[PDB]
Amino acid sequence: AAITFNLAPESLVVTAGSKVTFSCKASQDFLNSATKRNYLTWYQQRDGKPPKLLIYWASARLSGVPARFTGSGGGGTEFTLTISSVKAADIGTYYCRQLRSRPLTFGGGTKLTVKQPKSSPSVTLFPPSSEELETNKATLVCTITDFYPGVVTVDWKVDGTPVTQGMETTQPSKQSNNKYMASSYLTLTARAWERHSSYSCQVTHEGHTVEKSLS
Amino acid sequence: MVQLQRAGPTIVKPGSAVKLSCKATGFAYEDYYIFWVRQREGGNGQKWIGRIHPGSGETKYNDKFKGKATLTADTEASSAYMRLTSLTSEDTAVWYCGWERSVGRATFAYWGQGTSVTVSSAKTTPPSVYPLAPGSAAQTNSMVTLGCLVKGYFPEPVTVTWNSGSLSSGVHTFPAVLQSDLYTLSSSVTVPSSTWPSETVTCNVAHPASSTKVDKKIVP
Amino acid sequence: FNVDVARPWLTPKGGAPFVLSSLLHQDPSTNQTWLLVTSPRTKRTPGPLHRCSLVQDEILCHPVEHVPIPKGRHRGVTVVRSHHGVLICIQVLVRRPHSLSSELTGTCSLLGPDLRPQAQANFFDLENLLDPDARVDTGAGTEIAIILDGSGSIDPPDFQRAKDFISNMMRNFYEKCFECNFALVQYGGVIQTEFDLRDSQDVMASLARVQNITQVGSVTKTASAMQHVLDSIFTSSHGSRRKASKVMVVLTDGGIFEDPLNLTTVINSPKMQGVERFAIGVGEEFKSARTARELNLIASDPDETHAFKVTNYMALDGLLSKLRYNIISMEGTVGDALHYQLAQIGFSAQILDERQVLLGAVGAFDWSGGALLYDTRSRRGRFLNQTAAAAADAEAAQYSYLGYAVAVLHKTCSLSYIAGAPRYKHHGAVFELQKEGREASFLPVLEGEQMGSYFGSELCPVDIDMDGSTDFLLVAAPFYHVHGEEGRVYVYRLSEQDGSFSLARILSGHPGFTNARFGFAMAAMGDLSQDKLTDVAIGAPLEGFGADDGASFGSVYIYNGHWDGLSASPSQRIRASTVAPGLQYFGMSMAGGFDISGDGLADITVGTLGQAVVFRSRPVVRLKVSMAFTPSALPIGFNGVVNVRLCFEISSVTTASESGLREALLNFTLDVDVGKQRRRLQCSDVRSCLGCLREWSSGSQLCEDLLLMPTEGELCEEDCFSNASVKVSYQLQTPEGQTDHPQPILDRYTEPFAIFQLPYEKACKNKL
Amino acid sequence: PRGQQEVLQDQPLSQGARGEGATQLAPQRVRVTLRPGEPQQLQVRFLRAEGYPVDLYYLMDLSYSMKDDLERVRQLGHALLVRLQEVTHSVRIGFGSFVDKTVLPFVSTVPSKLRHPCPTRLERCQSPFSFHHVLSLTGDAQAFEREVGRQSVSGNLDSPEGGFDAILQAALCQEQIGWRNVSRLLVFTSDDTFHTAGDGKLGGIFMPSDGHCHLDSNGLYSRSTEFDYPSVGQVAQALSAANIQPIFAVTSAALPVYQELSKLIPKSAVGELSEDSSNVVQLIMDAYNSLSSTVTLEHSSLPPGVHISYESQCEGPEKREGKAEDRGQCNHVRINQTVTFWVSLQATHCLPEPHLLRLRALGFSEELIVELHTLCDCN
Ligand SMILES: *[C@@H]1O[C@H](CO)[C@@H](O[C@@H]2O[C@H](CO)[C@@H](O[C@@H]3O[C@H](CO)[C@@H](O)[C@H](O)[C@@H]3O)[C@H](O)[C@H]2NC(C)=O)[C@H](O)[C@H]1NC(C)=O
Ligand SMILES: *[C@@H]1O[C@H](CO)[C@@H](O[C@@H]2O[C@H](CO)[C@@H](O[C@@H]3O[C@H](CO)[C@@H](O)[C@H](O)[C@@H]3O)[C@H](O)[C@H]2NC(C)=O)[C@H](O)[C@H]1NC(C)=O
Ligand SMILES: *[C@@H]1O[C@H](CO)[C@@H](O[C@@H]2O[C@H](CO)[C@@H](O)[C@H](O)[C@H]2NC(C)=O)[C@H](O)[C@H]1NC(C)=O
Ligand SMILES: *[C@@H]1O[C@H](CO)[C@@H](O)[C@H](O)[C@H]1NC(C)=O
Ligand SMILES: *[C@@H]1O[C@H](CO)[C@@H](O)[C@H](O)[C@H]1NC(C)=O
Ligand SMILES: *[C@@H]1O[C@H](CO)[C@@H](O)[C@H](O)[C@H]1NC(C)=O
Ligand SMILES: [Ca+2]
Ligand SMILES: [Ca+2]
Ligand SMILES: [Ca+2]
Ligand SMILES: [Ca+2]
Ligand SMILES: [Ca+2]
Ligand SMILES: [Ca+2]
Domain termination site, one of B96, B119, B142? B119
CA distance B138 to B220: 11
**CA separation (Å) from C158 to C150, C165, C251, C494?**
9, 10, 11, 85
**Angle in degrees, CA C272, C278, C282, rounded to 5:** 120
Residues C6, C738 contacting (CB under 8 angstroms): yes
Does an interface of 3+ CB pairs under 8 Å exist between B and A? yes
CA distance D22 to D300: 24
- Count CB neighbours of C284 within 10 A: 10
Residues C431, C423 contacting (CB under 8 angstroms): no
Q: What is the DSSP letter of D28?
A: S
Residues B44, B64 contacting (CB under 8 angstroms): no
Residues C584, C610 contacting (CB under 8 angstroms): yes
CATH number for the domain including C726?
2.60.40.1460
D251 reaches C (C-beta below 8 A): no
Q: Which helix (H) or strand (E) holds A192?
A: helix A190-195
| Largest CA-CA distance found in chain B, in angstroms, rounded | 74
d(CA A51, nearest CA chain C) in Å: 23
Candidates A3, A35, A61: best to mutate against C (most CBs of C within 10 A) is A35
**C contacts of A32 (beta carbons < 8 Å):** 735-737
Residue C171: Cβ-neighbour burial (10 angstroms; 0-12, 13-18, 19+): middle
**D contacts of C367 (beta carbons < 8 Å):** 158
Which ligand ends up closest to the CA of C595?
A: 9
> Sign of dihedral through CA atoms C435, C437, C440, C443?
negative
User: Do B33 and B91 belong to one domain?
Assistant: yes
Residue C243: Cβ-neighbour burial (10 angstroms; 0-12, 13-18, 19+): exposed
State how many domains chain B has.
Answer: 2
Best CA proximity match to C658, nearest among A106, B2, D32, A33: B2
Residues C644, C707 contacting (CB under 8 angstroms): yes
> Sign of dihedral through CA atoms B42, B47, B50, B53?
positive
Of A34, A60, A101, the CB nearest to C734: A34
The answer to whether position C311 is within a domain reads: yes
SS3 letters for C424-469? CCCCEEEEEECCCCCCCCEEEEEECCCCCCCECCEEEEECCCCCCC
Residues C441, C384 contacting (CB under 8 angstroms): yes
**CA separation (Å) from B198 to A83, B169, B202, B218, B220?**
52, 19, 13, 12, 11
CA distance C405 to C460: 10
- C-alpha D91: how far from its chain's center? 13
- Count CB neighbours of C567 within 10 A: 18
Best CA proximity match to D134, nearest among D124, D123, D145: D145
Domain termination site, one of D290, D311, D344? D290
User: Do D284 and D302 belong to one domain?
Assistant: no
List the domain range (segments joined by +) for residue D340.
4-51+293-374
CATH number for the domain including D306?
2.60.40.1510
Cα end-to-end distance, chain D, whole Å: 6
Residues C210, C143 contacting (CB under 8 angstroms): no
Compare all CA atoms of chain D with the CA of C98 and give the residue at the minimum distance: D110
Which ligand ends up closest to the CA of C734?
A: 3
- C-alpha C408: how far from its chain's center? 18
| C660 with B61: Cβ contact below 8 A | no
Q: Give the amino acid at C318.
A: G
Q: Which residues of C does the annotation place in the binding site?
A: 463, 465, 467, 471, 527, 529, 531, 535, 595, 597, 599, 603
Q: Helix and strand tally (H, E) in chain D? A: 8, 14
CA distance C9 to C5: 10
Residues A54, A62 contacting (CB under 8 angstroms): yes
Beta strands (DSSP E) in B57-138 are 58-61, 71-74, 79-84, 93-99, 110-111, 115-119, 128-131
Q: How far is the CA of C615 from the centre of ligand 8 (A)?
A: 16
Residue D161 annotated as part of some ligand binding site: yes
CATH number for the domain including C282?
3.40.50.410
CA dihedral of residues D131, D134, D140, D144 (deg, nearest 10): -80
The answer to whether position C436 is within a domain reads: no
Residue D2: Cβ-neighbour burial (10 angstroms; 0-12, 13-18, 19+): exposed
User: Do B37 and B97 belong to one domain?
Assistant: yes
Give the relative orientation of helices C156-176 and C203-212 as an angle to the nearest 10 degrees. 170
Count of all residues that appear for chain B in the document: 220
Best CA proximity match to A8, nearest among A83, A111, A90, A77: A111
Domain termination site, one of B57, B84, B119? B119
**CA separation (Å) from B153 to B159, B160, B178, B186, C678?**
12, 13, 10, 12, 88
Which ligand ends up closest to the CA of D192?
A: 10
User: Do C637 and C609 belong to one domain?
Assistant: no
- Give the CB-side neighbour count of residue A77, counting CA atoms within 13 A: 3
CATH number for the domain including D69?
3.40.50.410
**C contacts of D206 (beta carbons < 8 Å):** 20, 609
The pairing of beta strand B46-53 with beta strand A161-162: unpaired
Q: Give the amino acid at D297.
A: L
Domain termination site, one of D232, D259, D290? D290
| B186 with A170: Cβ contact below 8 A | yes
CA distance D272 to B139: 133
Count of all residues that appear for chain C in the document: 768
CA distance C549 to B112: 52
**CA separation (Å) from C698 to A36, B104, C665, C745, D257?**
21, 10, 13, 18, 69
CA dihedral of residues D175, D179, D184, D186 (deg, nearest 10): -70
Best CA proximity match to C408, nearest among C301, C535, C532, C494: C494
Q: Name subunits touching A (3+ CB pairs < 8 A).
A: B, C
Q: Is the peptide bond before A149 cis (omega within 30 degrees of 0)?
A: yes
CATH number for the domain including B31?
2.60.40.10
Give the relative orientation of helices D278-290 and D70-85 as an angle to the nearest 10 degrees. 40
Q: Give the amino acid at D304.
A: P
User: Do D263 and D359 belong to one domain?
Assistant: no
The pairing of beta strand C620-621 with beta strand C745-746: parallel
| A33 with C664: Cβ contact below 8 A | no
Q: Which helix (H) or strand (E) holds C263?
A: helix C263-267
Q: What are phi and psi of C56, to 5 degrees?
A: 50, 50
D242: three-class secondary structure by DSSP: helix
User: Do D39 and D139 belong to one domain?
Assistant: no
Q: What is the DSSP string of C560-579?
A: -B-SSSB-SS-SEEEEHHHH
List the shell of residues around ion ligand 9, using CB closer than 5 Å. C 595, 597, 599, 601, 603
User: Do D321 and D238 belong to one domain?
Assistant: no
The answer to whether position C339 is within a domain reads: no
Ligand 5 in reach of C264 Cβ (< 6 A): yes
Domain termination site, one of D290, D308, D339? D290
Q: What is the DSSP letter of B216?
A: E
Residues C295, C254 contacting (CB under 8 angstroms): yes
After what residue numbers is chain D broken, C–N > 2.5 angstroms?
none
D253: three-class secondary structure by DSSP: helix
| D158 with C331: Cβ contact below 8 A | yes
Best CA proximity match to A66, nearest among A52, A51, A50, A48: A52
Domains annotated on chain A, with CATH: 1-115 (2.60.40.10), 122-214 (2.60.40.10)
User: Do C298 and C149 belong to one domain?
Assistant: yes
User: Do D43 and D132 belong to one domain?
Assistant: no
CA distance D288 to D80: 12
CA distance D316 to C639: 94
Best CA proximity match to C29, nearest among C86, C93, C113: C113
Compare all CA atoms of chain A with the CA of B35 and give the residue at the minimum distance: A104
Residues A171, B174 contacting (CB under 8 angstroms): yes
List the domain range (segments joined by +) for residue B189.
128-217
User: Do C313 and C261 belong to one domain?
Assistant: yes
Give pairs for A166-173: CB < 8 Å, separation 24+.
A168/B177, A168/B179, A168/B184, A169/B177, A170/B174, A170/B175, A170/B176, A170/B177, A170/B186, A171/B174, A171/B175, A171/B177, A173/B174, A173/B175
Q: How far is the CA of C670 from the centre of ligand 3 (A)?
A: 12
Q: How far is the CA of A52 from the centre of ligand 2 (A)?
A: 83
User: Do B180 and B96 belong to one domain?
Assistant: no
CA distance B98 to B4: 8
CA distance B138 to B133: 10
Cα end-to-end distance, chain A, whole Å: 58
Q: What are phi and psi of D325, to 5 degrees?
A: -70, -15
**B contacts of C56 (beta carbons < 8 Å):** 58-61
Helix runs in C177-202, H state only: none
Of C693, C695, C736, the CB nearest to A34: C736
Best CA proximity match to D120, nearest among D67, D82, D175, D43: D67
D176: three-class secondary structure by DSSP: helix
d(CA D212, nearest CA chain C) in Å: 11
- Count CB neighbours of A166 within 10 A: 13
Q: Is the peptide bond before D39 cis (omega within 30 degrees of 0)?
A: no
User: Do B93 and B156 belong to one domain?
Assistant: no
**CA separation (Å) from C221 to C194, C300, D71, D121?**
16, 20, 52, 34
CA dihedral of residues B21, B24, B28, B29 (deg, nearest 10): -10
User: Do C608 and C628 belong to one domain?
Assistant: no
CA distance A207 to A119: 10
Best CA proximity match to A29, nearest among A73, A78, A65: A78
**C contacts of D104 (beta carbons < 8 Å):** 75, 93, 102, 104, 342
Ligand 3 in reach of A208 Cβ (< 6 A): no
A100: three-class secondary structure by DSSP: coil
CA distance D282 to C695: 80
State how many domains chain C has.
Answer: 3
User: Do C176 and C301 belong to one domain?
Assistant: yes
User: Do B10 and B109 belong to one domain?
Assistant: yes
User: Do B46 and B113 belong to one domain?
Assistant: yes
Residues B107, B42 contacting (CB under 8 angstroms): no
The answer to whether position C195 is within a domain reads: yes
Q: What is the DSSP letter of D190?
A: E
List the domain range (segments joined by +) for residue C191.
142-322
Q: Which residues contact D98 (CB under 8 A, 6 or more apart)?
A: D59, D60, D61, D62, D129, D130, D131, D132, D161, D162, D163, D165, D166
Q: Which helix (H) or strand (E) holds C167?
A: helix C156-176
User: Do C87 and C171 belong to one domain?
Assistant: no
Beta bridge pairs of residue D309: D344
**CA separation (Å) from C327 to A194, C96, D157?**
110, 12, 11
- Name the experiment that determined this structure: cryo-EM
User: Do C159 and C307 belong to one domain?
Assistant: yes
Q: Which helix (H) or strand (E) holds B52?
A: strand B46-53
Beta strands (DSSP E) in D184-240 are 184-190
Compare all CA atoms of chain A with the CA of B36 and give the residue at the minimum distance: A104
SS3 letters for C579-614? HCCCCCCECCCEEECCCCCCCCCCCEEEECCECEEE
d(CA A18, nearest CA chain B) in Å: 26
The pairing of beta strand D29-34 with beta strand D369-374: parallel
The pairing of beta strand D24-25 with beta strand D40-47: antiparallel
User: Do B17 and B107 belong to one domain?
Assistant: yes
**A contacts of C665 (beta carbons < 8 Å):** 35, 37
d(CA C476, nearest CA chain B) in Å: 36
User: Do B18 and B112 belong to one domain?
Assistant: yes
D260: three-class secondary structure by DSSP: helix
- Give the CB-side neighbour count of residue B116, counting CA atoms within 13 A: 9
The pairing of beta strand C142-148 with beta strand C245-251: parallel
Best CA proximity match to C604, nearest among C549, C526, C676: C526
State how many domains chain D has.
Answer: 2
CA distance A7 to A28: 14
> Sign of dihedral through CA atoms B177, B179, B184, B189?
negative
A178: left (phi over 0), alpha (psi -120 to 50) or beta: left
d(CA C599, nearest CA chain B) in Å: 7
The resolution, in Å, is 2.9
The answer to whether position D379 is within a domain reads: no
CA distance C19 to C50: 9
Q: Which residues contact D366 (CB under 8 A, 6 or more apart)?
A: D24, D25, D28
User: Do B19 and B88 belong to one domain?
Assistant: yes
Ligand 2 in reach of C400 Cβ (< 6 A): no
User: Do D144 and D285 belong to one domain?
Assistant: yes
CA distance C596 to C7: 13
Domain termination site, one of C259, C288, C322? C322
Domain termination site, one of B119, B138, B173? B119
Helix runs in B89-211, H state only: none
The answer to whether position C405 is within a domain reads: no
**CA separation (Å) from D188 to A62, C92, D56, D136, D289?**
80, 36, 10, 16, 19
Q: Is the peptide bond before A9 cis (omega within 30 degrees of 0)?
A: yes
Residues A91, A81 contacting (CB under 8 angstroms): no
**CA separation (Å) from C450 to B174, C398, C454, C540, C673?**
92, 19, 8, 19, 57
Cα end-to-end distance, chain C, whole Å: 44
The answer to whether position D348 is within a domain reads: yes
User: Do C612 and C643 belong to one domain?
Assistant: no
Q: Which residues contact C545 (CB under 8 A, 6 or more apart)?
A: C515, C553
CA distance C664 to A34: 9
Cα end-to-end distance, chain B, whole Å: 58
Compare all CA atoms of chain B with the CA of A100 and give the residue at the minimum distance: B105
**CA separation (Å) from C222 to C217, C250, C273, C309?**
13, 9, 18, 17
Best CA proximity match to D53, nearest among D139, D182, D177: D182
CA distance C396 to C424: 10
CA distance D216 to C751: 61
Give pairs for C95-100: CB < 8 Å, separation 24+.
C95/D110, C98/C323, C98/C324, C98/C325, C98/C326, C99/C325, C99/C326, C99/C328, C100/C178, C100/C179, C100/C325, C100/C326, C100/C327, C100/C328, C100/D108, C100/D110, C100/D112, C100/D113
User: Do B101 and B173 belong to one domain?
Assistant: no
User: Do D19 and D89 belong to one domain?
Assistant: no
User: Do C628 and C612 belong to one domain?
Assistant: no
- C-alpha C193: how far from its chain's center? 54
User: Do B144 and B115 belong to one domain?
Assistant: no
User: Do B61 and B18 belong to one domain?
Assistant: yes
Ligand 6 in reach of D181 Cβ (< 6 A): yes
Residues B162, B172 contacting (CB under 8 angstroms): no
Q: Helix and strand tally (H, E) in chain B? A: 0, 19
The pairing of beta strand D54-61 with beta strand D91-98: parallel
**Angle in degrees, CA C62, C66, C72, rounded to 5:** 85
Q: What is the DSSP string of D106-141?
A: TS---HHHHH--SSSTTS------S-EEEEEEES-H
| C331 with D201: Cβ contact below 8 A | no
